[PDB]
Amino acid sequence: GMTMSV
Amino acid sequence: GMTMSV
Amino acid sequence: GAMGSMERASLIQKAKLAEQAERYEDMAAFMKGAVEKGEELSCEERNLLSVAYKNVVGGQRAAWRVLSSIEQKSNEEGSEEKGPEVREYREKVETELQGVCDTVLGLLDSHLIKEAGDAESRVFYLKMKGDYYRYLAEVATGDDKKRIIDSARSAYQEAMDISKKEMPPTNPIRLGLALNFSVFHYEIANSPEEAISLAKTTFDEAMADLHTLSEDSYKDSTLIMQLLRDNLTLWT
Amino acid sequence: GAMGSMERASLIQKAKLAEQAERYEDMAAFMKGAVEKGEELSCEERNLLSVAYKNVVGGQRAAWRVLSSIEQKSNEEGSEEKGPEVREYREKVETELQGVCDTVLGLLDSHLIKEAGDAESRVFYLKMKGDYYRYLAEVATGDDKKRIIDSARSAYQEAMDISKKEMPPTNPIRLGLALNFSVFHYEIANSPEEAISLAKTTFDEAMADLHTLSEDSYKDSTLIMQLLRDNLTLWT
Ligand SMILES: [Cl-]
Ligand SMILES: [Cl-]
Ligand SMILES: [Mg+2]
Ligand SMILES: [Mg+2]
Ligand SMILES: [Mg+2]
Ligand SMILES: [Mg+2]
């Protein structure tokens, strides 16, 4: 559900 | 290890 | 104060929004503004005040402990000298924490406690007074440490005396007060036997009164009884 | 600025202490002070700057989303009217978030980006510029929304062009830039096909270069490759 970014 | 308070 | 222009009800509404957003500094500032309107607080409002500041000072205490641990290691045998920065930053966090405690104690003194006549409000506020003097005691190291400790003790003791006279042994405020006074004895007053005795007697008296309660009240009481048991398991 | 009197090295040291204490607002203020000393930042220092502000704005974004959800529900059919408070408090958090983004963008513009000549610093700072315009875009609703979106796109695109020319496909900065530009396409630019294509091509090119790496570099690269895969699994 969470979109991953860094 | 944690002492409980409220 | 920056909240002086906002309606009391709007401050309460925004305190609840800040809680949902986990914005506890905002939540505390909103509830400070609500207290400063000068009207007494309802049960729900008192718990909003407590939740907000407990979370703010809880984060400060956790950070202070991290920094204090680093500082203590830096003062061991064989630790390289790194200058004043660790001490300075621990002092910065400590000063901010003291400021929050002073703010809460100021709200209690002007004028929450003196207007609180019912046992549920008076015991709640006196427990808070004990709690925030306890947090001041955790970082105290100077001339006034004994007086800070005794201020915590005195507030807890007055709350205990009222709670035993006016509340049943399963009352969650009475139980949480006893839990925290027991922690005060163990962590602050160097009195682990008093801490253990208080927690055991509180637990046993509450156990014997559970039969009087509804299912919902039984859940509220047993939740705090389990915290007393957790401490007793840690301490014995 | 309040950090103008503190040594650069002391600011860096205290930024690392604040990170250990999870005091990210302090960490950001210390690193802002270090940037304002006017010297370029080392690799480690750049990552301290990024960590600090990513955590601060991350908390603000999470709170803004909570409040925006509440506000949207309040504007549905059959929702009781509760006054301006939800909007006001969402606006308060939004303004604070915009202020943090503006601060970061100001540091990049005065004068981190113009002094950054090596690929590793220039790509890092241009990715940051894209990221903080993306965060502004998430809350934008007015006349300048298209220009905010294009500012994010332009910064990401310049970073991508340099990274493809100057860095191997497994470079963690290149990988994280591509990850975030892919998120920009999916969440901001309404371009899910571009998002998917970028993430797949980035992943596959990195896969084919892993054989050149040490065990430690392989761990760093595969960590970010897994984030690309996570998004592809969410999106397909
Ligand atoms: Cl400091
Ligand atoms: Cl507000
Ligand atoms: Mg009024
Ligand atoms: Mg009264
Ligand atoms: Mg100097
Ligand atoms: Mg240069």
Phi, psi dihedrals of residue D79, rounded to the nearest 5°? -90, 130
Residues 6+ apart with CB under 8 A from C234: B1, B3
The alpha-carbon gap from D172 to the nearest alpha carbon of chain A, in Å, equals 10
| Residue B6: closest C-alpha in chain C | C176
CB-based contact D89 C17, cutoff 8 Å: yes
Task: Pick the closest to residue D128 from D31, D201, D226 (CA basis).
Answer: D31
Number of domains in chain D: 1
Half-sphere exposure of C173 (CA within 13 A, CB side): 25
Task: Pick the closest to residue C211 from C200, C201, C202, C222 (CA basis).
Answer: C222
Whether C55 is covered by a domain: the verdict is yes
Task: Pick the closest to residue D106 from D30, D9, D32 (CA basis).
Answer: D32
The alpha-carbon gap from C220 to the nearest alpha carbon of chain B, in Å, equals 13
Burial class (CB in 10 A: 0-12, 13-18, 19+), D158: middle
Burial class (CB in 10 A: 0-12, 13-18, 19+), D152: buried
Q: Which ligand is nearest to the CA of D96?
A: 2
**Maximal C-alpha separation, chain B:** 16
CB of C16 closer than 8 Å to CB of C48: yes
CA of C115 to the centre of ligand 4 (A): 4
Residue D12 to residues C87, C91, D7, D110, D125: CA-CA distances in angstroms? Answer: 15, 17, 9, 19, 18
Structure tokens at D220: 């760093």
CA distance D81 to C204: 49
Chain B residues closer than 8 Å to C176 by CB: 6
Handedness of CA C134, C140, C145, C148 (dihedral sign): negative
CB-based contact A3 D180, cutoff 8 Å: no
Phi, psi dihedrals of residue C30, rounded to the nearest 5°? -65, -45
Whether C2 is covered by a domain: the verdict is no
CA distance D195 to D3: 41
A in contact with C (at least 3 C-beta pairs within 8 A): no
Q: C191: domain CATH number?
A: 1.20.190.20
Cis-peptide, bond into residue D111, ω within 30° of zero: yes
Residue D91 to residues D71, D139, D181: CA-CA distances in angstroms? Answer: 11, 10, 27
Question: Which residues are found with C-beta within 5 Å of the ion, ligand 1?
Answer: C 88-89, 92
Residues 6+ apart with CB under 8 A from C229: C203
Amino acid identity at D217: S
When CB atoms are compared, the residue of D18, D63, D83 closest to C22 is D63
CA of C96 to the centre of ligand 1 (A): 11
CB of C21 closer than 8 Å to CB of D67: yes
CA distance C89 to C108: 29
Whether D1 is covered by a domain: the verdict is no
DSSP-derived secondary structure for chain D: -TTTTS-HHHHHHHHHHHHHTT-HHHHHHHHHHHHHT-SPPPHHHHHHHHHHHHHHHHHHHHHHHHHHHHHHHHTSTTPPP--SHHHHHHHHHHHHHHHHHHHHHHHIIIIIHHH--SHHHHHHHHHHHHHHHHHHHHH--STTHHHHHHHHHHHHHHHHHHHHHHS-TT-HHHHHHHHHHHHIIIIISS-HHHHHHHHHHHHHHHHHHGGGS-HHHHHHHHHHHHHHHHHHHHH-
Task: Pick the closest to residue D19 from D63, D61, D53 (CA basis).
Answer: D53
Structure tokens at A5: 């970014």
Asked if D81 is an interface residue toward chain C (Cβ–Cβ < 8 A), one would say: no
CB < 8 Å & 24+ apart, contacts of C100-107: C100/C28, C100/C53, C100/C56, C100/C57, C100/C60, C101/C57, C101/C132, C101/C133, C101/C135, C101/C136, C103/C32, C104/C53, C104/C57, C104/C128, C104/C132, C105/C129, C105/C132, C105/C133, C107/C32, C107/C35, C107/C36, C107/C49
CB of D195 closer than 8 Å to CB of D186: yes
Phi, psi dihedrals of residue D145, rounded to the nearest 5°? -60, -40
Domain range for residue D150?
A: 8-236
Cβ count within 10 A of residue C42: 11
**What is the distance, to the nearest Å, from the Cα of residue C190 to the centroid of all Cα atoms in its chain?**
19
Cβ count within 10 A of residue D86: 20
Asked if D80 is an interface residue toward chain C (Cβ–Cβ < 8 A), one would say: no
Structure tokens at D34: 């270090």
Whether D37 is covered by a domain: the verdict is yes
CA distance C235 to C224: 17
| Residue C181: closest C-alpha in chain B | B5
Residues 6+ apart with CB under 8 A from D110: none
| Residue B3: closest C-alpha in chain C | C231
Residue D57 to residues D96, D160, D219: CA-CA distances in angstroms? Answer: 9, 23, 27
A in contact with D (at least 3 C-beta pairs within 8 A): yes
Chain D residues closer than 8 Å to C86 by CB: 17
Structure tokens at D216: 């430690």
Task: Pick the closest to residue C33 from C17, C14, C19, C47 (CA basis).
Answer: C14
CA distance C112 to D180: 51
Task: Pick the closest to residue C25 from C99, C94, C95, C91 (CA basis).
Answer: C99
Whether D215 is covered by a domain: the verdict is yes
Task: Pick the closest to residue C52 from C8, C91, C17 (CA basis).
Answer: C17
* 3-state SS track over C102-166: HHHHHHHHHHHHHHCCCHHHHHHHHHHHHHHHHHHHHHCCCCCHHHHHHHHHHHHHHHHHHHHHH
Whether D3 is covered by a domain: the verdict is no
DSSP-derived secondary structure for chain C: -TTTTS-HHHHHHHHHHHHHTT-HHHHHHHHHHHHHT-SPPPHHHHHHHHHHHHHHHHHHHHHHHHHHHHHHHHTSTTPPP--SHHHHHHHHHHHHHHHHHHHHHHHIIIIIHHH--SHHHHHHHHHHHHHHHHHHHHH--STTHHHHHHHHHHHHHHHHHHHHHHS-TT-HHHHHHHHHHHHIIIIISS-HHHHHHHHHHHHHHHHHHGGGS-HHHHHHHHHHHHHHHHHHHHH-
**What is the distance, to the nearest Å, from the Cα of residue C212 to the centroid of all Cα atoms in its chain?**
29
| Resolution, angstroms, 1 dp | 1.8
CB of D178 closer than 8 Å to CB of D195: no
Helices and strands in chain A: count of H runs, count of E runs: 0, 0
| Residue C173: closest C-alpha in chain B | B6
CA distance C40 to C111: 9
DSSP-derived secondary structure for D112-180: IHHH--SHHHHHHHHHHHHHHHHHHHHH--STTHHHHHHHHHHHHHHHHHHHHHHS-TT-HHHHHHHHH
Q: Which ligand is nearest to the CA of C120?
A: 4
Question: Which residues are found with C-beta within 5 Å of the ion, ligand 3?
Answer: C 7
D in contact with B (at least 3 C-beta pairs within 8 A): no
Whether C30 is covered by a domain: the verdict is yes
Structure tokens at C213: 């309660």
CA of D155 to the centre of ligand 3 (A): 49
3-state helix, strand, coil in chain B (%, to 5): 0, 0, 100
Whether D224 is covered by a domain: the verdict is yes
Q: Which ligand is nearest to the CA of C3?
A: 2
Cβ count within 10 A of residue D221: 22
CA distance D236 to D231: 9
Chain B residues closer than 8 Å to C46 by CB: none
CB of D64 closer than 8 Å to CB of D139: yes
User: Which chains sit next to D, with 3 or more Cβ pairs under 8 A?
Assistant: A, C
CA distance B5 to C28: 20
CB-based contact C21 D93, cutoff 8 Å: yes
Q: What is the dihedral of CA C149, C196, C179, C147, to 10 degrees?
A: 0
CA of C47 to the centre of ligand 3 (A): 21
Q: Which ligand is nearest to the CA of C8?
A: 3
CB of C42 closer than 8 Å to CB of C120: no
